[PDB]
Amino acid sequence: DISTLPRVKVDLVKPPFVHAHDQVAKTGPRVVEFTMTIEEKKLVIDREGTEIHAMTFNGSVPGPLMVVHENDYVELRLINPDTNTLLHNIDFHAATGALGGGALTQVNPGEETTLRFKATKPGVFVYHCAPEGMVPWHVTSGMNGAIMVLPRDGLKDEKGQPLTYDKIYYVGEQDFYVPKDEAGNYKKYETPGEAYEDAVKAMRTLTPTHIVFNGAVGALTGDHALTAAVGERVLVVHSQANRDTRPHLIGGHGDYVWATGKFRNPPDLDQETWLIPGGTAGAAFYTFRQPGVYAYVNHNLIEAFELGAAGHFKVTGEWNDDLMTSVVKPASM
Amino acid sequence: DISTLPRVKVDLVKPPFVHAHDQVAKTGPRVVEFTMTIEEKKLVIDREGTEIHAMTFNGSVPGPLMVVHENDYVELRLINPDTNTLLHNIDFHAATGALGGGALTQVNPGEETTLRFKATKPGVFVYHCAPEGMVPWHVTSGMNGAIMVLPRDGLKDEKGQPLTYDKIYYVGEQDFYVPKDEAGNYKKYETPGEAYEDAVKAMRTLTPTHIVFNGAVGALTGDHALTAAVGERVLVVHSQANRDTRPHLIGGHGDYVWATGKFRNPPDLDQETWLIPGGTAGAAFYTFRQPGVYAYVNHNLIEAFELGAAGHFKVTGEWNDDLMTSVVKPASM
Amino acid sequence: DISTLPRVKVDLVKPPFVHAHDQVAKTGPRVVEFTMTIEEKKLVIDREGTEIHAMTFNGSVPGPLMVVHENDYVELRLINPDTNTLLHNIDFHAATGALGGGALTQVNPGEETTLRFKATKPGVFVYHCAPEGMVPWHVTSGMNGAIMVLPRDGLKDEKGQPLTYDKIYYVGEQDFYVPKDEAGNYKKYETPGEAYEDAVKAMRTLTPTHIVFNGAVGALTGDHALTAAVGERVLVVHSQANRDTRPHLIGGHGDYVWATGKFRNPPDLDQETWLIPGGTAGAAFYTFRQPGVYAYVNHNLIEAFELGAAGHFKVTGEWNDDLMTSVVKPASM
Ligand SMILES: [Cu+2]
Ligand SMILES: [Cu+2]
Ligand SMILES: [Cu+2]
Ligand SMILES: [Cu+2]
Ligand SMILES: [Cu+2]
Ligand SMILES: [Cu+2]
Numbered sequence: 001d002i003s004t005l006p007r008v009k010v011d012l013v014k015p016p017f018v019h020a021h022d023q024v025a026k027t028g029p030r031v032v033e034f035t036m037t038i039e040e041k042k043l044v045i046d047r048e049g050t051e052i053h054a055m056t057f058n059g060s061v062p063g064p065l066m067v068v069h070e071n072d073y074v075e076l077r078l079i080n081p082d083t084n085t086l087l088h089n090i091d092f093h094a095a096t097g098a099l100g101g102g103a104l105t106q107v108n109p110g111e112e113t114t115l116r117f118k119a120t121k122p123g124v125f126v127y128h129c130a131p132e133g134m135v136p137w138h139v140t141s142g143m144n145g146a147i148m149v150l151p152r153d154g155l156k157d158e159k160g161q162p163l164t165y166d167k168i169y170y171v172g173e174q175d176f177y178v179p180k181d182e183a184g185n186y187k188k189y190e191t192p193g194e195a196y197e198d199a200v201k202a203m204r205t206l207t208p209t210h211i212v213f214n215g216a217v218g219a220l221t222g223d224h225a226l227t228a229a230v231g232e233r234v235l236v237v238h239s240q241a242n243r244d245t246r247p248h249l250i251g252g253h254g255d256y257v258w259a260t261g262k263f264r265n266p267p268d269l270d271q272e273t274w275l276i277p278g279g280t281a282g283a284a285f286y287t288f289r290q291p292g293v294y295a296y297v298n299h300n301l302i303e304a305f306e307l308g309a310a311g312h313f314k315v316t317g318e319w320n321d322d323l324m325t326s327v328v329k330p331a332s333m
Numbered sequence: 334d335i336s337t338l339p340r341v342k343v344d345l346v347k348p349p350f351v352h353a354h355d356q357v358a359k360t361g362p363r364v365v366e367f368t369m370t371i372e373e374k375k376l377v378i379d380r381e382g383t384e385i386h387a388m389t390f391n392g393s394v395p396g397p398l399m400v401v402h403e404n405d406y407v408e409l410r411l412i413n414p415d416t417n418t419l420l421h422n423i424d425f426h427a428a429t430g431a432l433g434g435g436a437l438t439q440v441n442p443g444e445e446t447t448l449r450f451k452a453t454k455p456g457v458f459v460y461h462c463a464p465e466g467m468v469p470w471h472v473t474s475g476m477n478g479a480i481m482v483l484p485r486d487g488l489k490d491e492k493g494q495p496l497t498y499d500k501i502y503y504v505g506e507q508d509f510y511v512p513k514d515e516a517g518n519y520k521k522y523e524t525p526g527e528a529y530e531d532a533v534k535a536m537r538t539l540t541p542t543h544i545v546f547n548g549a550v551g552a553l554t555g556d557h558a559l560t561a562a563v564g565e566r567v568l569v570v571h572s573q574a575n576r577d578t579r580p581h582l583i584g585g586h587g588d589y590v591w592a593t594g595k596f597r598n599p600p601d602l603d604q605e606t607w608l609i610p611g612g613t614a615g616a617a618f619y620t621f622r623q624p625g626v627y628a629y630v631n632h633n634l635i636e637a638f639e640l641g642a643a644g645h646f647k648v649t650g651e652w653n654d655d656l657m658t659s660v661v662k663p664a665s666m
Numbered sequence: 667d668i669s670t671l672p673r674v675k676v677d678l679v680k681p682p683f684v685h686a687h688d689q690v691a692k693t694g695p696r697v698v699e700f701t702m703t704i705e706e707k708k709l710v711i712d713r714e715g716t717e718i719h720a721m722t723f724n725g726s727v728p729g730p731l732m733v734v735h736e737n738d739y740v741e742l743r744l745i746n747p748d749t750n751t752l753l754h755n756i757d758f759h760a761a762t763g764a765l766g767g768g769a770l771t772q773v774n775p776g777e778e779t780t781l782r783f784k785a786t787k788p789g790v791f792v793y794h795c796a797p798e799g800m801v802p803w804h805v806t807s808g809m810n811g812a813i814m815v816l817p818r819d820g821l822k823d824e825k826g827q828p829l830t831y832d833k834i835y836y837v838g839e840q841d842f843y844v845p846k847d848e849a850g851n852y853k854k855y856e857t858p859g860e861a862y863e864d865a866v867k868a869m870r871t872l873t874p875t876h877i878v879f880n881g882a883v884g885a886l887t888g889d890h891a892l893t894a895a896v897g898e899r900v901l902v903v904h905s906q907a908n909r910d911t912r913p914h915l916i917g918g919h920g921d922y923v924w925a926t927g928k929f930r931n932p933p934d935l936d937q938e939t940w941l942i943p944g945g946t947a948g949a950a951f952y953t954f955r956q957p958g959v960y961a962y963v964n965h966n967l968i969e970a971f972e973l974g975a976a977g978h979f980k981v982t983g984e985w986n987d988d989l990m991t992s993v994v995k996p997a998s999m
Contacts (some may be wrong), residue, residue, distance in 0.1 A: 002655070022530030039400060075660060082666070093605040097657040099584045104659040113662035121586060121603040130583075136634040155691075158931075179913065203635045206540055207872055241633050244579065244608065244944040250757060251765045253787060259926075260592075262600040265491075269930040270787040272759040273945035276912065277579040279606035279632025290763030299945025301802040301908050302869045322668070324763040326770040327741060328780035333748070334990070359741045408993060415999070424916060424939040430956030430990040433774045437992040454919060454936040463916075469967040499848035539873055575967050577912065579942065593925075597935040598824075610912040612939035612965025 002031060002073060002116070009033045012064040015145075015214055016169040016226060016236075023164060025092065031116070032068045035077040038107070040084045043142070045176060045210055046217045046308065047148040050186055052178060054215070054257065055086065055129065055141040056242035061215030062172025063127070066235060068119050071150050075116040076101075082110035085192055087131050088138065092117060093279070094125035094147050102130045119149040124281035133238040137199050140177055141300040142215060144241035146281045147172060151263050155235075155285070156268035157256055163234035163285055169226050173298065173309055174215065175208035175243045191257035207241070211298060220311025226296070228288050229315025236296070237261075239281040245309070246274040248286065248299035251292070254284035273299045290324065291317040293307025335364060337405060344368045345391055345397040348478075348547055349502040349559060351570075354400040356487035356497060364449070368410040371440070373417045376475070377510060379550045379641065383519055385511060386528065387548070388419065388462065388474040394548030395505025396460070396478025398570060398582050401452050402485050408449040409434075415443035418525055420464050421471065425450060427458035427480050435463045435537070452482040455625045456550045456595035457614035461574040469575065470532050473510055475548060477574035479503060484596050488568075488618070490589055491599035494619055498568035502559050505643055506631065507548065508541035508576045533538070544631060545641040553644025559629070563650025569629070572596075572614040578642070580617065581606040581632035584625070602646035606632045623657065624650040627639070668697060668739060669784070675699045678730040679697035681811075681880055682835040682892060684903075687733040689820035697782070698734045701743040704773070706750045709808070711842060711876055712883045712974065716852055718844060719861065719879070721752065721795065723806040727881030728838025729793070731903060735786050735818050741782040742767075748776035751858055753797050754804065758783060759945070760791035761814050768796045777835035786791060787930035791912040791946035794907040802908065806843055808881060810907035810969050812947045817929050821901075821951070823922055831950055835892050839964065839975055840881065841874035841909045842843040848904070850916060874909070875995025877964060878974040885975025894954050896983025902962070903927075905947040911975070913950065914939040914965035917958070920950035939965045956990065 008030050013019050036058045043054040047323040057063030068074055080088055087108050091100035095117035098104045105113050128144035156161040179187045179198035189195030213220050228234050239245050256267035261281040276282040298309035341363050346352050369391045376387040390396030413421055420441050424433035428450035431437045438446050461477035489497040512520045512531035522528030529598040546553050561567050571580050587602035592607040594614040631642035674696050679685050702724045709720040723729030734740055746754055753774050757766035761783035764770045771779050794810035807991040820830040845864035853860030879886050894900050896967045904913050922933035927947040942948040964975035
């Protein structure tokens with residue numbers, strides 16, 4: 001009887017941060033309560049000022065990372081305020097049945113719904129909006145995020161030993177398809193209905209105009225760079241709801257990676273770069289060994305440096321000259 | 334002496350069905366005899382009525398799934414009737430030598446050949462036509478399928494325990510490159526020779542016009558949806574002879590997946606989505622837990638919902654409200 | 667004290683060959699000294715005579731394979747002669763800190779630098795140039811290669827048994843983005859500065875004009891085909907610094923594959939085709955069983971046969987009719 005179980009209300013945070021949780025479950029199974037409010041909003045996604053009509057869970061691209069343990073129940077209150085214009089729903093890749101919940105969570109503006117599902121499989125998973133007939137449009141408008149279902153005894157390495165992270169970040173990578181005119185400039189649209197056919201045309205090119213982390217070019221840079229200290233263990237959860245990516249920590253590695261994100265599998269060790277297929281979340285665990293600026297990218301470097309799929313870590317601490325040093329600094333022949 | 338071995342004649346079926354076989358070999362090694370007849374034919378591939386000149390093994394896109402056991406011999410009689418206009422051959426990725434058999438199976442219209450190879454490696458494998466100088470043209474005209482080489486003791490999980498499927502389906506995914514004029518409409522062609530240069534141009538865009546399951550948009554929907562019952566164990570073999578895909582069961586998982594299709598490797602567990610590289614067959618084993626309509630897609634959702642890479646399962650049985658339920662149905666604030 | 671360690675100078679060779687090394691380390695840790703000289707040069711990359719301004723390490727695309735053992739120190743003298751016009755540097759994916767060395771190795775024409783890093787992780791790894799603000803331009807101009815960090819006790823199979831190769835080759839796969847005019851012909855450029863914007867435009871299409879092995883269409887064919895004998899164990903290291911590939915030995919397999927290239931992981935067995943993500947090196951070990959011509963391809967067959975990603979092996983030895991035979995040669999009905 002699910003009513004006999006503890007209920008715990010989670011208060012979500014904006015990516016790339018992650019709400020408070022315990023790696024190792026400190027209670028038995030729980031009903032873990034989440035509320036997300038759908039927000040359609042304009043977002044500026046690049047340095048040029050390109051503005052799109054984004055479709056968000058909880059106001060962000062990506063939507064927030066939800067965290068539970070295996071065999072918890074996830075109970076989501078999904079709210080579609082009447083300030084929105086479109087119907088939305090949600091497909092949880094962590095869930096079993098009804099198109100991941102999509103068939104049960106169709107909410108018009110001015111409606112809400114509450115879905116519960118049992119999180120039977122441990123891993124990081126994509127969640128995304130998926131309204132019948134307009135699935136890729138919602139997803140590539142930003143309407144996706146991820147959920148992490150931790151093993152009840154936390155993460156393990158390839159030998160069954162504990163892996164415990166000190167910090168966790170969630171990098172949502174978004175492929176956008178801003179319609180272009182024949183000369184190559186972005187078009188603008190008066191209504192979602194008027195935008196739809198040109199959105200479809202743009203999607204069918206299979207060529208994103210923008211590929212961004214945390215909803216915009218440069219979002220995880222400057223004062224919003226990711227941070228860590230030398231010696232800290234960091235888990236980076238990375239999702240891509242629609243298109244393949246290949247994450248890479250420039251200057252580091254994925255010490256332990258679940259590239260397709262499912263923790264009953266042993267991790268791959270020492271990855272330089274890993275492929276997260278579109279429609280998947282993956283997770284990489286790294287212990288920083290060197291201070292300084294790192295760049296965290298999709299290692300299609302065009303996608304990273306021209307289209308936006310690059311963020312930074314600023315790492316504090318001691319430099320280790322045994323691990324790397326400039327023996328002779330750049331100088332003239 | 335191969336002549337001392339049993340010979341068994343297989344009678345193939347049209348995808349997504351699979352000819353009768355035993356998971357665990359009930360005999361010693363056999364020469365397993367297959368006949369396929371090449372058919373060049375017009376096919377309508379979308380709802381608009383777009384008609385292409387397809388190149389098929391046995392009249393279907395994909396060609397049929399062939400099933401043997403490890404260390405059986407596959408003996409294929411390949412027939413190219415004089416009603417066809419082109420030369421064809423076959424590359425079995427399961428085979429060793431002579432370009433997978435391609436160098437030994439060049440048949441002009443009005444010819445046939447018989448190839449034998451030993452199936453030394455267990456797995457699902459792509460087979461495809463590959464005539465020197467026109468390889469991608471044949472493959473992206475539909476001229477590919479798959480062969481499953483089962484371990485003699487059937488499939489095993491990651492711990493060495495048996496995995497036994499109740500039902501098997503074969504999903505062949507086809508990237509087509511229908512040539513477009515500058516305005517974006519599909520062109521039509523009088524002869525394969527006249528079509529060739531525009532086919533090459535279209536292929537070189539690396540942007541499929543269509544990506545379909547079982548040879549057409551909607552082929553695995555309606556009365557031709559895949560079926561299962563709650564509690565049934567289903568193996569879905571999925572091939573892509575030319576281009577990456579990322580399969581996903583919307584509402585389910587791959588409980589055990591061999592993403593690159595080779596059964597001497599332990600499967601990956603609990604996959605949401607998995608990458609089958611172009612030129613590969615993969616296999617996913619799932620036990621259904623919920624009834625209803627599922628969609629089985631390439632989770633590049635543009636490729637699925639706009640370009641055609643989507644099919645359905647209709648699953649019968651009991652709904653499990655513990656696993657998923659609508660706590661509060663969509664209703665007004 | 668690194669000064670107390672042996673120093674060994676390596677003399678590099680041009681791909682696809684690999685400098686002399688020992689699989690199992692015959693000494694303790696060493697400082698392994700490499701020198702590479704940057705060369706900007708014109709290269710003809712196709713049969714049409716298309717000429718690009720390539721950016722190379724040591725005069726080749728790809729740059730040479732460097733080989734060390736785990737816990738050796740790699741000490742690279744990187745020379746940028748004043749005959750070059752651009753600034754360059756190097757990111758070693760094998761290294762930890764300073765953007766893989768990129769932050770420490772910025773050399774203008776007429777400068778050199780020496781970088782040392784400890785090779786703490788075994789695997790094959792990409793190295794590439796990565797100057798701030800022009801990273802994909804350098805990489806997709808050919809300025810990348812690979813480094814293999816062998817386990818000190820050489821390679822192991824999935825059971826911990828030794829795998830010893832008889833021959834090793836390095837296949838560097840390069841995506842080029844030669845700018846096109848609206849009619850589709852390649853443009854030519856007077857200076858790297860004048861070329862830059864059109865290079866960026868071309869890259870942003872995400873559609874390579876050329877995808878080649880060893881720097882040109884047909885480079886690993888004819889008198890420069892790879893060779894082997896029946897019964898020889900061959901390791902093929904394959905890198906792609908910017909874009910996914912899917913290698914396949916036509917007529918063979920990857921008996922043991924580290925698709926993402928890191929040797930602390932067990933290899934995948936019996937691969938037909940494997941995905942090397944862009945920004946990664948992978949390695950495939952195969953024992954040849956049949957003589958003849960093999961084709962080694964990216965199994966996006968358009969990328970292979972139309973865009974250039976195909977090479978050959980010529981294998982000498984005995985044909986095995988048990989493994990494959992033509993039972994009935996192509997003949998008329
Ligand atoms: Cu939506
Ligand atoms: Cu989905
Ligand atoms: Cu053919
Ligand atoms: Cu092939
Ligand atoms: Cu450079
Ligand atoms: Cu890199």
